């Protein structure tokens, strides 16, 4: 339900400096960064499909396959005689 943040009308109140980074903020930053990257490498900003994110995901999936096979053969060496 409630989501708001009215304007503070008190001059003697508290002002919240030194903000952190929210999950929302970091997601928005990652999005705008992927959008700039798309607009630079390609000439798309409509972002209907992002092949760059797919490529990065592909390389990281390769890395995950790597580390998974590694730990798998490791525990295989240990458990088996």
């Amino acid at each position: 339900f409630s989501s708001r943040t009215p304007v503070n009308e008190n001059p003697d109140g508290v002002q919240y400096r030194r903000g952190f980074v929210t999950r929302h903020q970091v997601s928005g930053w990652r999005f705008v960064m992927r959008r700039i990257a798309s607009g630079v490498a390609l000439h798309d900003t409509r972002m209907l499909v992002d092949p760059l994110r797919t490529q990065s995901r592909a390389v990281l999936t390769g890395a995950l396959i790597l580390v998974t096979g590694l730990v798998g053969c490791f525990i295989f060496s240990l458990f088996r005689p």
Binding site: S3, R23, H24, S27
Partner: protein, 33 residues
């Protein structure tokens, strides 16, 4: 001064301009996560 007579006719129309306001949709309302 005055040594020749110029005749006044319809001005050539300026390129079209418009006053019609341009509304913009309000941004999304910050979904959850």
């Amino acid at each position: 001064m005055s040594r020749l007579i110029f005749e006044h006719q319809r001005r050539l129309t300026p390129p079209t301009t418009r006053k019609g306001t341009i509304t913009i949709e309000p941004p999304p309302q910050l979904p959850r996560v």
